[PDB]
């Protein structure tokens, strides 16, 4: 419907409250694979005035050790919305994931 249900779920991610090696990688994993989920996650952190240096050390730890390549992909949704990007000098990759498989 048009109505918008509002609730308080701070026990889903809370990267600013969660700290661990594997425990973190696991939380980020589902947040990097599940789109329908990450959609509410990437927006959740920002809601709590999260910092890139934070979500980065979290997601990155879950992804490769190359400054988290795919980390900026699913996270781009935020950096793009706020328009405050400009951390790294440059980065390249393949846009195959974007293309469908039909």
Task: Find the domain containing 67 and state its range.
Answer: 1-102
Question: From which experimental method does this structure derive?
Answer: NMR
* Tally of domains within the chain: 1
Answer for the pair 69, 63: CB distance below 8 angstroms, yes or no.
yes
Give the closest residue to 57 by CA, choosing from 39, 41, 75, 33. 75
Sign of the C-alpha dihedral computed for residues 89, 20, 50 and 76 taken in this order: positive
Alpha-carbon distances of 9 from 36, 50, 61, rounded to whole Å:
16, 16, 23
Which two three-digit tokens encode residue 10? 């701070």
Q: Estimate to the nearest angstrom the gap between the alpha carbon of 77 and the chain centroid.
A: 8
């Amino acid at each position: 419907p048009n109505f918008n249900l509002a609730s308080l779920n701070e026990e889903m991610f809370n990267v600013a409250a969660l700290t661990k090696r594997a425990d973190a990688k696991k939380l980020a994993k589902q947040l990097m694979g599940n789109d329908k989920l990450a959609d509410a996650a990437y927006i959740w952190w920002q809601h709590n005035r999260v910092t890139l240096d934070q979500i980065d050390t979290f997601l990155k730890l879950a992804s490769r050790k190359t400054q988290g390549a795919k980390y900026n992909q699913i996270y781009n949704s935020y950096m793009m919305h706020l328009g405050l990007t400009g951390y790294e000098p440059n980065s390249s990759s393949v846009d195959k994931l974007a293309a469908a498989l039909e």
